[PDB]
Design a protein around this ligand. Structure first.
Ligand SMILES: Nc1ncnc2c1ncn2[C@@H]1O[C@H](COP(=O)(O)OP(=O)(O)O)[C@@H](O)[C@H]1O
Ligand SMILES: Nc1ncnc2c1ncn2[C@@H]1O[C@H](COP(=O)(O)OP(=O)(O)O)[C@@H](O)[C@H]1O
Ligand SMILES: Nc1ncnc2c1ncn2[C@@H]1O[C@H](COP(=O)(O)OP(=O)(O)O)[C@@H](O)[C@H]1O
Ligand SMILES: Nc1ncnc2c1ncn2[C@@H]1O[C@H](COP(=O)(O)OP(=O)(O)O)[C@@H](O)[C@H]1O
Lengths: 459, 120, 439, 438, 449
């Protein structure tokens, strides 16, 4: 049916594709160049303790701030934490911009993401019989009831999987499901032992040639055992439990069904639902059938949060079941977004700032820039002459780390369209002239936009 | 209300003598020049054309045409006559060799084919 | 047809020597701007390769310097092989949804998922249906060229009854779904009735074989798969809008599944371009979202254009170049367009006059070229079509000088209009509301 | 008929060469602006150009809205003319760009010709003839006819409660049908029944009519976005079920363009691009003008006529920016700009006479002169308002025509804004008991 | 039992001559204001004038809210007293002028006699009869239900309309149930199982009820109190019929809507007919807008129209502000925070600050009301705080001091317990000094500014 694409399956590359981890010793000391990092050794060592804090699951609602200029590796460090923790730990990254929903108050949006960052792992056994129905056969009862035409004591079903055949001697009451599900010989079904009912998956594709036309989707025979008993591990965030309770999904009535056909707006879930959820979740943790997995909420551009957001996070962080929150900011001394006459460091309210472990990220030395260029080049697969590495790194020092890194892909193309696989200074010198930086372009605005009457910039 | 308004063509949608617009406009806007009619959809069903996705959303051209024309109550009744079979596949098609089998005509029905509820 | 002559209709591609990316001075409708056209051609090579995720490119320059013309040329030469979403920045300010939500959609419109599919579909005119209500039955169905009798299963007979199928209906059966569509009635049955139901449509009978089988290629954006999964019949929202703020765990789950389809070769991912025109209308909250959004493995390449000098950033009160945060410009490489020379204007006016099929005399094109130098390219361009209409009132075959001159005196250019405002200061309404209606 | 502000304006009053007559079709003067509007009319009727922008610019009361309405009538009724003010864009229900986009498409028309095959008669027979196809017999005073019915129009007739003896209307081409009533030949079946007895139709039972039908691309959008009318019965509950405007996607508008083009190729439909007029265009904000840059670049797009009366004014939504007309300078480059100049004293006398004979007011020439003085010294728009009061005053004084006394009496009863500003100055001396609230 | 700020106010404490007794009904002083509020009470009880406004103007703590509560008690429970703050006008669901009209019409009462025409009995038999709809597509429909109702006195068989049978289906009625069928609405209520089936052996807690006494068919007379707002709302979002709109209206989320003036003028005519029929009497009441300075220029402009209405209530405004900026009209300042224009419509009752001996007397009334015993030294000490700080402040000390007293086992509050309460519980100004003195320094221990 679907035509498989057989040729190639290579990865794309993005700004952080080289970051593979924090690059730390077993002693937790940072190596000067490891896992794609260069420098930031102190900031990587601090983030290493943060990883150990998260992975220890001891603490709730601790705050961390990554503070430092733009380009100093703050989001690289966050992504490295997410990679150090691995996909089992929840990691919910947002910007502060994402909080301004039109559907709900922004503190609900903040609390939603807050409980996405908390995972729950539930282990249960699944126990079902499966197959195509080979046979259905009543047994008459030895003591038939008076006045009734038939009395059935058992209902035999033969189930076939790809791996076996079994005769299920079922309780007679399963007649109800067979009629309502319209189970035929050759239909694929399962029977679940916690109810004893059955459900029809479909007609087996072993019969797809019975007719020239039939309104059947045909489904493969189950490739498991005929009897599947195994433990299953379910991972849900506590936000999933919020929504599963506040917007129940399975409802059979007209209002439920109109509901699931309309735009599903989120709703300002109550503290008493979340609190009632928390209390029952804690019951199962004490029984040991569930385990809590506190993750990380990473808020990028946290200076975009306003004072109403921050004053809510005060409360949220005090709750016993809370993620680690990592903020990142670069805004120096700046006005708090919602309090136009309060200026504070990082743009974070001083009341809230006292809560955070603060990790500074410093600028990069010229030799760190050059090492990053080579790591970035070998990630984009660009091959450079050493003179080209130097010329690119010079733009990194004189202009910006980001700018110099961005020239590698343009220069790679200009090289190959001259038949060269290795980029050299002549190609860099052309990339840098086709593609201006912020400052050289801003100089044009000052010079050509010196007047606006015609052929000038709009200002 | 006078019957001039309520009955004799003061209502724009209801055709009759003295409402010659409504019968034309009913036919042309809901059937002839209507993107959801099966004859129109079938011209756009391929490539990067606007109904290209229809192949994988588990609905027929007839069902697509029905859902575009019936109101949300009528559609909700029709939805009562349906089965959560993609949720049952999650119970059954489970082993690695089942490769999370999904009918290719239901390929984009991702969140229905996998969600925790059915397993729970 | 619907495609009337618009402002960029002459732009038929980027006009570069594809083996070398060197811009040919005038080709595919583009004139001049070689440095900008070469930079645009290099961006295409990044786009077409698709390996680089989330580069942002700003095309900056004065008004009427080809910033849209160049972006249109890229769309024309990238071709429908790849998604090219065009977003005006004003469109992000939805009432239905967040600004960042509206941007999350525009980013995902620009990533294709491509699937190649064999569908086996029977289409034909129904000749008769027979049912043995003793369930089983037979369908007789024809094309113009073939006819057959098919054994129908009971569920097929039920579906045929529910669809009220009768002789002379064109039906399709999708063998994979097993679902009927009544397509219409054959034109041969037009004589059956004196009055027809509103819903009935006539068709030509299907042609060729009945059970056609076809290799189809499907290209579907990540945004379409979001909206489909957002709610039970979400595919309706693809047209009406009405998505709401699609919850992120849906998008995360879709992204994970699409990664499997690539790993299994069931699909390929086709990264495309988002062009955000007049990007200075975004605000400080938008740019902060776009910073993080670019840093993603499934990000498109983003192109944007601005004509602003140093100007106030929206959502704040300090100024910055292009109207954009310096924090944002640190992620952007910049292509600058320039004003045109008189010889480049002469060509662009000729390209436009050809598209509008207007016969300029050489002197009309000369004068019109001076006007474009003195009064701007768009103004002179607008006088081409105006002068044609004035010449036609003379029944003239060619646009003469006098027709351009009369167009010039009747329609003010911006600079002459700004003068007129200044000489009318007290008769026009000033910024303080004062006006005098007296003579 | 009623008399609104512009009802004297019949058209631009242009010669065959397109030169403006100094007074014609109700205009006086503005010859330069009328000639330029004449070229805009040619641009609209020569269907080939999309998205040309025009600006009317000039003082209040210089005739910009007269010129836009003169265009509308030179253009006739065939072509869509969609007038809005910039103030109407601020819906509470969809984003401003959707409101602009919907109005762009209201200005593009699509003309279809249907032959409407109408049957109207008393039902004589309703016999099934299929396993479901009927024969319906229809009767009028002039004969009978039998119609073979498609199974689906039969159900339409069956949902109407049609029975033998009812009078029904059928559109046999569109599939519409209506129960008109029960024929009054049955009026004495009973002495009382809750029934509407109507005479049998006295005309021919079958009528064939040529109808030229106009729709717009926006009607197609609306019809394709949501179930409409009697399809959407649950809409009666309101709240979430109301037929709200929604942010129609470009994917929808692109499918409509494709489907419409199909019917143009078959010759069934005729495309008619028209005009969007945006008066008070200075009320558009900076975000609206940004979208209009993109929106005017689509290959299907109407010709857009702005009007503005602002001098150098702040752009709404961008306080730092001031520009002429209140139009951001980026956008002003695209527009063909027509200036409208102030009227002179003798031109005002002419406009007064045209307005008087439009309202049916008869004036002495001394009354003309006195009224015209108020146009010079106060406002043209104040002259014209005085004419209707003075006509009332004259007739209750028993006179057949308005004279200086009735004008002078009207002047005193109905102040202009300038004299009333003098009152506000002299009386607003304090917030005291007789002061105006400043 | 629970004691609030105004629990001692019982009325205006006026003579039959309309003169204030210097201390009566919980008041001390405000005699001129109590006398003016007496005349307002008599304006309301006269039920003859629409749309008269009263401003209670005076500083915070001068008893403006006490007086409004006293008016409510002088009027008693028959008359609508509708109290709001200006802050309540700012609905997100509907425009602010809508909540003004709703509250204007909550202030107008109506007493109406209603006949319930009703059927009752044990359901003895129940049998549906059906229509064979040929081409509707929905299949068959029940055309009537035949039901047998039995009471103690008699019996009937009813052929019910389909829409009344749908009411019985919603009510889950079965044979042997006792039911009630209000023919006014067509509503059905299941009262229970008949006592003839009274048995322990059913798993569900059934209501076994005796057979209805009297005839199966009855007419009940009921006197109902409604406001005009209840009628407005009933008719805006209908829920009383058995039609499909009423049915679905019971399932959708409740939602306020901008009820039109067409509906209000229509409901005036409905009510006027009840009055002309003699089944109703109008009971026009009073709307109290507390914190009226929190209204805005759009609200005040709307009241200029709304108070012209020939059935508008009496409106009492309270304001505590001197010359202040009108909200939404940031250039305009006026006394009371009320626009000068609208102030001309009101009768202003000024209220005045208390003397030291009045404060001392309020302390005793309030102490008696909270049920706490003080020494006279204690009463004097508390009264000193009322003079030096604030009446409100000194009254807040009585409850803390009683606990502190009881903690030492003494049942009567004496000066030591107030002396402790003063130090545990500061007033606004002692707290403001701590702010200012500490605010000399920043750092860790500064207050955030
Ligand atoms: N120490 C480092 N080693 C390698 N690459 C880095 C390092 N720091 C930053 N980069 C890269 O340089 C760019 C700037 O870092 P980023 O984390 O985006 O800065 P910030 O978050 O502080 O704005 C990114 O592409 C990032 O991957
Ligand atoms: N290099 C060019 N070649 C051909 N046409 C051009 C060129 N530059 C501009 N134009 C045309 O002139 C007009 C204005 O240019 P455009 O790019 O749209 O303006 P802007 O520079 O403000 O984006 C458009 O009709 C455009 O197609
Ligand atoms: N040249 C003219 N000849 C006749 N009537 C005119 C002329 N110009 C304006 N009017 C009329 O004078 C009045 C004011 O002009 P109007 O077009 O409304 O002004 P604005 O330019 O402010 O929109 C209108 O009644 C209009 O019909
Ligand atoms: N004359 C009075 N007699 C007794 N208690 C009073 C008197 N005036 C005010 N109070 C009480 O003092 C407190 C303040 O009065 P209140 O009416 O709240 O002032 P405001 O004018 O601010 O509403 C309330 O507890 C009230 O019951």
């Amino acid at each position: 049916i679907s035509e498989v694409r057989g040729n190639t399956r290579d990865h794309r590359t993005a700004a952080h594709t080289h970051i593979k981890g924090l690059g730390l010793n077993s002693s937790g000391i940072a190596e000067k160049q490891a896992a794609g990092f260069v420098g930031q050794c102190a900031a990587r060592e601090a983030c290493g303790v943060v990883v150990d804090l998260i992975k220890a699951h001891k603490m709730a609602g601790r705050g961390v701030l990554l503070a430092g200029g733009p380009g100093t590796g703050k989001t690289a460090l966050a992504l490295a934490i997410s990679q150090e923790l691995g996909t089992k730990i929840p990691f919910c990254p947002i910007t502060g911009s994402e909080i301004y929903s039109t559907e709900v108050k922004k503190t609900e949006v903040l609390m939603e993401n807050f409980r996405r960052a908390i995972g729950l792992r539930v282990r249960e056994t699944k126990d079902v019989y499966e197959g195509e129905v080979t046979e259905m056969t009543p047994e008459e009862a030895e003591n038939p009831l008076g006045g009734y035409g038939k009395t059935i004591s058992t209902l035999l079903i033969g189930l076939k999987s790809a791996r076996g055949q079994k005769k299920l001697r079922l309780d007679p009451s399963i007649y109800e499901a067979i009629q309502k599900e319209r189970v035929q010989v050759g239909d694929v079904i399962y029977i679940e032992t916690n109810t004893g009912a059955c459900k029809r998956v479909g007609r087996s594709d072993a019969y797809a040639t019975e007719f020239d036309l039939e309104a059947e989707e045909y489904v493969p025979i189950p490739k498991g055992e005929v009897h599947k008993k195994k433990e299953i591990v379910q991972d849900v965030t506590l936000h999933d439990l919020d929504v599963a309770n506040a917007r129940p999904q399975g409802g059979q009535d007209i209002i439920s069904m109109m509901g699931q056909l309309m735009k599903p707006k989120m709703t300002e879930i109550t503290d008493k639902l979340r609190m009632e959820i928390n209390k029952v979740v804690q019951k199962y943790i004490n029984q040991g059938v569930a385990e809590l997995i506190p993750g990380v909420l990473f808020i990028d551009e946290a200076h975009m949060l306003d004072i109403e957001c921050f004053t809510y996070l005060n409360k949220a962080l005090e709750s016993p079941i809370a993620p680690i929150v990592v903020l990142a900011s670069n805004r120096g001394i700046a006005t708090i977004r919602g309090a136009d006459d309060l200026k504070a460091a990082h743009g974070i309210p001083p009341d809230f700032l006292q809560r955070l472990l603060i990790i500074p990220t410093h600028p990069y030395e010229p030799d760190e820039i050059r090492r990053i260029v080579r790591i970035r080049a070998q990630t984009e697969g660009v091959q450079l002459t050493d003179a080209a590495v130097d010329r690119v790194a010079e733009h990194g020092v004189r202009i910006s780390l980001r700018y110099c890194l961005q020239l590698l892909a343009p220069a790679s193309i200009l090289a190959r369209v001259n038949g060269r696989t290795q980029v050299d200074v002549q190609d860099i010198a052309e990339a840098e002239e086709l593609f201006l930086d912020a400052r050289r372009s801003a100089n044009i605005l000052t010079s050509t936009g010196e007047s606006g009457g015609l052929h000038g910039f709009i200002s | 209300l006078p019957r001039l308004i309520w009955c004799d063509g003061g209502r724009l949608d209801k055709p009759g003598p003295g409402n010659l617009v409504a019968g034309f406009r009913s036919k042309y806007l809901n059937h002839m020049m209507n993107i959801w009619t099966p004859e129109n959809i079938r011209s756009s069903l391929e490539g990067i054309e606007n109904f290209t996705w229809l192949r994988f959303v588990d609905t027929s051209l007839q069902e697509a045409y029905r859902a575009s024309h019936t109101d949300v109550f009528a559609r909700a009744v029709d939805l009562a006559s349906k089965q959560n079979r993609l949720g049952h596949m999650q119970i059954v098609y489970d082993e690695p060799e089942d490769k999370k089998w999904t009918p290719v005509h239901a390929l984009f029905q991702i969140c229905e084919r996998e969600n925790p509820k059915a397993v729970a | 047809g619907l495609n009337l002559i618009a402002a960029h209709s002459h732009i038929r591609g980027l006009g570069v020597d594809a083996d070398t990316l060197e811009p040919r001075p005038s080709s595919q409708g583009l004139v001049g701007q070689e440095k900008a056209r070469k930079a645009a051609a290099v961006v295409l090579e990044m786009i077409k390769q698709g390996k680089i995720a989330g580069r942002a490119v700003l095309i900056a320059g004065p008004p009427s310097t080809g910033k849209t013309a160049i972006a249109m040329g890229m769309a024309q030469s990238l071709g429908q092989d790849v998604p090219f979403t065009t977003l005006a920045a004003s469109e992000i300010f939805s009432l239905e949804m967040s600004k960042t939500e509206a941007l999350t959609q525009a980013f995902r419109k620009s990533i294709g998922v491509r699937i190649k599919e064999e569908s086996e579909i029977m289409e034909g005119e129904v000749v008769e249906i027979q049912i043995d209500r003793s369930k089983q039955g037979k369908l007789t169905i024809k094309t113009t060229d073939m006819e057959a009798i098919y054994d129908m299963g009971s569920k097929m007979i039920d579906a045929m009854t529910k669809e009220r199928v009768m002789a002379g209906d064109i039906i399709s059966i999708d063998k994979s779904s097993g679902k009927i569509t009544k397509l219409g009635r054959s034109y041969a049955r037009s004589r059956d009735y004196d009055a027809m139901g509103v819903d009935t449509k006539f068709l030509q009978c299907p042609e060729g074989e009945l059970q056609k089988r076809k290799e189809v290629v499907h290209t579907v954006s990540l945004h379409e798969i979001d909206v489909i999964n957002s709610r039970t019949q979400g595919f309706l929202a693809l047209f009406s809008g009405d998505t709401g703020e699609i919850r992120s765990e849906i998008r995360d789950q879709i992204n994970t599944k699409v990664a499997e389809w690539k790993e299994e070769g069931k699909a390929e991912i086709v990264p495309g371009v988002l062009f955000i025109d007049e990007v200075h209308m975004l605000d400080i909250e938008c740019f902060s979202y776009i910073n993080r959004a670019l840093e993603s493995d499934l990000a498109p390449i983003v192109i944007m254009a601005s004509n602003r000098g140093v100007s106030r950033i929206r959502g704040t009160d300090y100024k910055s170049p292009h109207g954009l945060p310096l924090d944002f410009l640190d992620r952007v490489v910049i292509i600058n367009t320039h004003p045109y020379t008189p010889d480049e204007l002469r060509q662009i006016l000729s390209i436009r006059a050809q598209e509008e099929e207007v016969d300029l005399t050489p002197d009309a094109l000369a004068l019109l070229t001076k006007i474009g130098q003195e009064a701007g390219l768009r103004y002179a361009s607008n006088l081409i079509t105006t002068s044609q209409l004035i010449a036609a009132k003379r029944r003239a075959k060619q646009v003469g000088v006098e027709d351009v001159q009369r167009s010039f005196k009747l329609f003010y250019d911006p600079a002459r209009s700004v003068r007129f405002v200044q000489e009318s200061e007290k008769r026009l309404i000033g910024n303080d509301g004062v006006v005098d209606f007296s003579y």
